[PDB]
Amino acid sequence: SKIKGIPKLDDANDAGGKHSLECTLILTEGDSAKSLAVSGLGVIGRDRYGVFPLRGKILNVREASHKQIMENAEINNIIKIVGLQYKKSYDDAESLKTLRYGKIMIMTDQDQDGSHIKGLLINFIHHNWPSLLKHGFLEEFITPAKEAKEYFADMERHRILFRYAGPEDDAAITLAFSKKKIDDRKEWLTNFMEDRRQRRLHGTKHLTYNDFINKELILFSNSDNERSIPSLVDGFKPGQRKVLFTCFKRNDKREVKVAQLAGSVAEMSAYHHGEQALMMTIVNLAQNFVGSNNINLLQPIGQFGTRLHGGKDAASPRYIFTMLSTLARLLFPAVDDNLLKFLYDDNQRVEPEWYIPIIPMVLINGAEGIGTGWACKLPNYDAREIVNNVRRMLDGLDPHPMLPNYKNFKGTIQELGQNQYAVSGEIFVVDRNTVEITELPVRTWTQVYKEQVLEPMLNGPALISDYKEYHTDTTVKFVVKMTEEKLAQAEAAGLHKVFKLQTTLTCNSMVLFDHMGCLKKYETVQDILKEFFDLRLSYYGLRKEWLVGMLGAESTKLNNQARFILEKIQGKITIENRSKKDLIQMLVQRGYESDPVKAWKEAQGPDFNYILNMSLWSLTKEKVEELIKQRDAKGREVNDLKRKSPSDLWKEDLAAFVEELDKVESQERED
Amino acid sequence: KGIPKLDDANDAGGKHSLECTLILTEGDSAKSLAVSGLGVIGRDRYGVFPLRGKILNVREASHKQIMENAEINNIIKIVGLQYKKSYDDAESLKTLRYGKIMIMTDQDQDGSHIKGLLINFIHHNWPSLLKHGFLEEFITKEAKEYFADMERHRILFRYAGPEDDAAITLAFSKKKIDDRKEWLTNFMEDRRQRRLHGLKHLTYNDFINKELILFSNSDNERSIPSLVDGFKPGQRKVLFTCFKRNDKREVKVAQLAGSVAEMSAYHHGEQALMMTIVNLAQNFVGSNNINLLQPIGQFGTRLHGGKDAASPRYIFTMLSTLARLLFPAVDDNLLKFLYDDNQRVEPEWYIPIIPMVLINGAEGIGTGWACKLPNYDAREIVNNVRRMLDGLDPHPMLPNYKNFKGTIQELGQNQYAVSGEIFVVDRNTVEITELPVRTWTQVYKEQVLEPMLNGTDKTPALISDYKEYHTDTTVKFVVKMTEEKLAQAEAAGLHKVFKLQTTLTCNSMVLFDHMGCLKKYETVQDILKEFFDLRLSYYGLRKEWLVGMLGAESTKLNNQARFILEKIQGKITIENRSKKDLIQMLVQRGYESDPVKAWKEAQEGPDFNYILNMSLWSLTKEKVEELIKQRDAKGREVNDLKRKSPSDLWKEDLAAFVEELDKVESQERED
DNA sequence: AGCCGAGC
DNA sequence: TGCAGCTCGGCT
DNA sequence: AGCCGAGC
DNA sequence: TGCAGCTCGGCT
Ligand SMILES: COc1cc([C@@H]2c3cc4c(cc3[C@@H](O[C@@H]3O[C@@H]5CO[C@@H](C)O[C@H]5[C@H](O)[C@H]3O)[C@H]3COC(=O)[C@H]23)OCO4)cc(OC)c1O
Ligand SMILES: COc1cc([C@@H]2c3cc4c(cc3[C@@H](O[C@@H]3O[C@@H]5CO[C@@H](C)O[C@H]5[C@H](O)[C@H]3O)[C@H]3COC(=O)[C@H]23)OCO4)cc(OC)c1O
Ligand SMILES: [Mg+2]
Ligand SMILES: [Mg+2]
Ligand SMILES: [Mg+2]
Ligand SMILES: [Mg+2]
Ligand SMILES: [Mg+2]
Ligand SMILES: [Mg+2]
């Protein structure tokens, strides 16, 4: 037997023949990895090794529908290449004779997503052919072009065999991959996170499936949560946060191509994944159509998608541009950068563990994510209402309950009960024969509504006679015709009901990482707001301590510079033709201070560079007066700050933000 | 019907067919601007279909290429055209689903080329359709605005006589190459003159001679290299951008490309740029004798002639250390940098120290002409340049490829035999250790050894076996044959039989000279001499620039030293003097306005900042002494430069280049 | 017939 | 240049 | 039966 | 992420 219709397969010369069972099918993570293996095998490896590339994550066939399984081209390819048959039991040494290959060797990246793929392959064989695992059907090739040929020459040092030991192997695989084991996964990961936390307060040719799952795959599952579930503090996940950290660093005064920014992010922040995911993240951060961001931190310069297709109509990231919103640094003040804990990736300082915005951004743009064991979903809330709640809390008052609010949505959102809402579009009777639809419930896209609601009403029993569209890019308007009879009935029943203009929004999975990096479930947004509030208030306290110290050091620095300049122009000191050593010694003796700002930073020989690096211009009339004013202004600045409370600082930030939010949003409505 | 990318006009195929217009767009994106421009009402009388760029030139293409052309067939099916059918009368026009084709392309030169190719397609198969006025064009949210003003954007092509036939024919027939040379020669000549002086319906004749010809000429300007630096403009923009960036570590190719686009105003798809970057860095046998960019990653190999290069998003590059040795930074001061919309971009040409056009085999295809030069040896060219500097005639040069192990022998003027290497080991064995330049290993294996081993339907087998022992950069086949077959092959000529000899003919050495005029060179000696005269004269300009600049730097340091000496002696004070008083005083003591700034201004109030910006450290002992040394050294440097001739400067550059070339190449042999 | 490479 | 598979959980 | 989005 | 059509001239 040969394999005819699979272009990407390199079949082993002896596959399907008499030495079938001695043949190994290598499944690789992607086409590039195939090339490395095909090269490392050389001509001599072509005899007993086949190579076939997987395109990333494999269908989880456990509990997948029959249709999705039968139609899955990748699984069907593997089945064809190996000679497998659904429902066949491979116990006999004779039942094996119908196979073209005797084993599959999995070859992925030695990273967490690689482990996920190994597990999905294991899951696939385990679900359909458990018997196969008893014969040691599965193996893996671990790594850290010339290096390729080397790895393969030493293949038996890179080759690990999966081993089925008992029913605990079955339980582990099922735990990882069964849709019925979600709760077990929550417990599984809770134990893992707790145990690792404890370890931090202090300090085989063969591998069972139980150990692979519990010691290797679990690392992917945990990383999946870390990358997919947002922080309560800034509302970001790590990829989004790396994007903002990079934009803040670059400080672009003009638009940058999305693909170019993504390349720049990967470099500046040690992002370790495919840049195409990064580009999608960037697009998602810039979107501003109804039902996306309430405050987009990046500007969508170009086609970033519309409500017609829910953003699926975004242009390629090579053709669109972005830059920071003017609101971004008002929300994430640069001064607070000094208070953050910046992370390190291999000696390089990259993004902070979290930013600390002036309002809970996790509520503003609708934190959303799917991990393992847990997922997160929050709706959007109104920025002004949140600012008003923070002010109330600053004044010792109680915050008003908040309803979800989406920018530019003309519809209605009603609270049914805790974390349960009815979201309604807008429909109104014009005359008999005519209704008009001018808003769709949030996250209902215009093209989808037309196709799934209006078309079926018009065609396959038909309820309406006709409809017409008068949409713009940002608005919806359908005019629908029907007989009085039908309209009267439609109207008898609820119009919003018949035209499917009501959806429910339920939020019982507000799961976020707290400020300590612990995953937590929040019951109400008021709980989220309060936890954010206490942390942010504490950080305005830190900001004030930081500023008083730094501005104090700056004041001392200017006092010393000014003293030196006044003494120079009066003849009280001279430096002309003095040696460096003597000038230092002299300055010390006369009580000048080693760089005060440098000393302060370090505290978080003497250095008189800050004095002697001043230009000769400094000795002239206008510059002397200027220096005296700067020195007195700095003194007043520190004094003014000492008098203020952290609450006052927060209130200043909120006022500046609202002012610009007003300008920006008015301007958007003109445009 | 059954054609995915087509948005058929509702009335297409009905009784209103001839009143329908099919809009053919330049790519899928353009199709969308059109679809949203027609609004709802437009869908009735307008279809939209996207072209994937350049259309097949059908005028003399083979029947197979035409029959198998997917996009041509789709257009034919959509419009309802039929080969060979005449459309003279009114009855014939009745089988058409559309009455008009409206072409909508970019308003640029490549857009004109596509209009031209579409016109060519219809004119060739159905010239009867053109005398009716079948073809028209649409010239260019904002989309809806163009389509409501449809008539101001709609231009109709007009067939007006045999001169329309000749023009279409001139442009697109394989038989009219010579006419195109003359056609463009006249255009270049005429445009050249106005350069000294100054500054609805459309016939096919006016379209071809007024619009298409601008593409034909632009095609030459981007495809045919300059004699001076061996670059086309895209390549030149790339190097200009690398020089400006001065990267000290590797940069992703995709990212470099994005950086070139913005820094140099490259107005084409970045994917083209990424391929240019890859081609500039390649260093396998038969590519570049000197790669100006380093290939960090998989940039392709001789196995597949570079077709095996990985994606530009996964590979990195940076300047070769040879780059600024060949294109010295000092010479940038002599170039003519171009402007694109107020941004200064790359120069008309760089002026390297040897004729790079000969080193890397400048090569391209335009309209009317094409260019092909083979590679020449860098050291041999350096030697020839040194001979010319001594007033001697350069020796003739044969093409020479780095790391090529075979032979290249002249057969006639501009004609060479290039031979690989094959030798008889024993009476059953031959060994092939080199393939002729540009014969790739995998292609040789598939097209020569495989057929020799297996025979074909049309040829017998010659060999009994072969084995491969290649490395990434070398070739080694060991071939088995019967004694009888080998004797036969020897008698016929082993190199001939084994396809290890090819011809290299160079009768199309067409380049732009230093004035930007297209020229045909008969010998490389003529290229070398023209280059030499220009480069020598630019060494003269460089000396004149260096004497002026160093002179100014000397004057600057003289004034700084003087002021510092007069200060530390009490001869002058600035302490507490106003700006005006101090400037007036410096004038009256005869201090010079910034001499370097004054000199740079001359190359196209009093400024004493270069003095008064000096730090206070300047007045101290060790800095006084250091300044006096700098001053005296600058003076020595001016006179050192003044006793060097242009020829001396050139020889210094040549020596520095050869030293690094030896180092670089011997390091390459190690690795 | 199809390569070469800067473009669509 | 544009096109397409999948995972994971909550929700519908 | 499928969205949401950071990933392969 | 990887895959594929075409132009244009000189030559194999
Ligand atoms: C073909 O060769 C390989 C493909 C892959 C997958 C993949 C697999 C697909 C498939 C598409 C994709 C594709 O994802 C699409 O990318 C798009 C990128 O731009 C944005 C705008 O939109 C994204 C799509 O949302 C995503 O669906 C790949 C990008 O990065 C990957 O890892 C993806 O449709 C068919 O099956 C992995 C490999 O080895 C690891 C391969 O060798
Ligand atoms: C599908 O949508 C459109 C496609 C196009 C063509 C195109 C057309 C093709 C085809 C491929 C291509 C492709 O060229 C390939 O690109 C590759 C890009 O990376 C490098 C490494 O290697 C390049 C290939 O050498 C080139 O062959 C396009 C890239 O830029 C273009 O203009 C190309 O195979 C089938 O037909 C134009 C449009 O509107 C103007 C479209 O809407
Ligand atoms: Mg990986
Ligand atoms: Mg969102
Ligand atoms: Mg264009
Ligand atoms: Mg070349
Ligand atoms: Mg699911
Ligand atoms: Mg041709």
Side-chain angles (χ1 to χ4, degrees), chain B residues 574-616:
Chain B
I574 67 181
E575 282 80 349
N576 204 223
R577 308 179 74 105
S578 65
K579 188 175 175 181
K580 292 175 181 165
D581 192 27
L582 180 61
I583 288 184
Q584 282 199 19
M585 184 190 65
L586 291 173
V587 174
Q588 292 171 3
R589 292 192 62 85
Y591 283 91
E592 299 212 26
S593 189
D594 188 334
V596 165
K597 165 169 142 309
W599 187 82
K600 286 200 310 175
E601 288 167 355
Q603 317 306 311
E604 51 213 16
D607 185 351
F608 295 114
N609 286 119
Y610 70 106
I611 297 174
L612 294 171
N613 286 349
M614 283 184 291
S615 69
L616 293 166

Side-chain angles (χ1 to χ4, degrees), chain A residues 29 109 111 113-114:
Chain A
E29 188 176 353
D109 294 344
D111 55 31
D113 284 278

Side-chain angles (χ1 to χ4, degrees), chain B residues 140-417:
Chain B
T140 46
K141 292 188 170 187
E142 323 76 33
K144 300 179 180 172
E145 302 179 358
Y146 302 146
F147 289 78
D149 197 19
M150 187 91 170
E151 218 48 34
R152 299 184 209 171
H153 293 113
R154 179 186 182 227
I155 304 295
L156 293 113
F157 293 107
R158 174 181 182 248
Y159 175 88
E163 65 277 2
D164 271 22
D165 299 311
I168 290 172
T169 297
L170 159 71
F172 293 106
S173 175
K174 319 283 195 216
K175 306 164 190 170
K176 299 288 180 187
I177 292 168
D178 284 314
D179 292 335
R180 291 190 286 272
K181 287 188 168 65
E182 173 182 18
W183 177 56
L184 292 157
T185 303
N186 296 331
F187 177 85
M188 288 175 301
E189 172 72 304
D190 179 21
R191 178 184 59 161
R192 177 166 305 116
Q193 298 226 267
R194 300 193 199 93
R195 184 186 177 275
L196 296 176
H197 312 349
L199 189 146
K200 194 166 305 307
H201 297 65
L202 180 51
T203 59
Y204 296 106
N205 174 73
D206 284 352
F207 167 75
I208 293 307
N209 298 292
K210 295 181 177 190
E211 184 176 343
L212 184 64
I213 201 177
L214 305 181
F215 160 81
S216 300
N217 179 71
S218 278
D219 183 29
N220 288 145
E221 304 188 338
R222 77 190 187 196
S223 306
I224 295 186
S226 162
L227 168 150
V228 182
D229 58 16
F231 288 138
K232 308 142 209 191
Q235 295 173 322
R236 193 172 298 109
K237 294 183 182 289
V238 171
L239 274 294
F240 160 80
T241 299
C242 298
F243 285 153
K244 190 162 180 170
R245 303 182 68 230
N246 193 18
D247 304 292
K248 308 300 184 168
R249 59 193 170 78
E250 60 282 333
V251 169
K252 241 178 210 151
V253 168
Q255 190 79 1
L256 181 53
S259 168
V260 175
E262 67 183 0
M263 289 177 52
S264 83
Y266 179 81
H267 299 317
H268 305 288
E270 283 171 27
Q271 295 298 315
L273 249 192
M274 292 167 214
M275 294 181 76
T276 294
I277 292 157
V278 159
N279 170 276
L280 288 169
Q282 291 171 332
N283 68 1
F284 50 86
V285 176
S287 58
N288 295 306
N289 277 5
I290 300 180
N291 51 296
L292 299 169
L293 268 43
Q294 301 184 44
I296 307 164
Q298 173 58 97
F299 279 67
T301 68
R302 68 183 303 173
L303 184 69
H304 301 283
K307 302 288 178 268
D308 47 345
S311 163
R313 295 128 61 200
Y314 305 143
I315 56 183
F316 300 78
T317 194
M318 54 180 301
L319 288 170
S320 170
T321 53
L322 296 168
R324 273 306 203 188
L325 291 183
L326 287 157
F327 301 90
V330 63
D331 288 328
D332 284 11
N333 297 293
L334 310 177
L335 307 182
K336 198 189 191 171
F337 292 87
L338 305 174
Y339 285 76
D340 190 281
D341 182 19
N342 294 286
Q343 184 188 6
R344 214 182 75 153
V345 294
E346 88 290 356
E348 55 179 355
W349 34 254
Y350 283 98
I351 181 71
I353 74 170
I354 53 185
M356 290 297 302
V357 79
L358 301 178
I359 299 292
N360 290 333
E363 135 179 67
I365 312 152
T367 300
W369 301 265
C371 182
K372 190 181 84 185
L373 273 96
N375 288 201
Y376 288 83
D377 182 74
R379 288 172 183 88
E380 169 155 37
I381 281 164
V382 169
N383 191 77
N384 269 339
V385 163
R386 282 169 176 162
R387 290 181 55 88
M388 300 174 64
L389 284 171
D390 286 334
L392 302 173
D393 284 323
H395 295 333
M397 298 183 286
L398 299 174
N400 188 291
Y401 284 82
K402 185 171 67 159
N403 287 329
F404 177 58
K405 296 195 297 191
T407 60
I408 300 184
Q409 54 195 317
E410 192 176 15
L411 295 173
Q413 190 196 345
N414 296 333
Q415 222 179 143
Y416 312 83

Side-chain angles (χ1 to χ4, degrees), chain A residues 93-112:
Chain A
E94 195 254 4
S95 59
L96 298 172
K97 293 179 172 177
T98 194
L99 300 171
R100 311 188 60 258
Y101 283 90
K103 43 280 192 61
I104 292 171
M105 168 178 277
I106 186 69
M107 178 180 305
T108 66
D109 294 344
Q110 191 78 25
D111 55 31
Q112 299 107 297

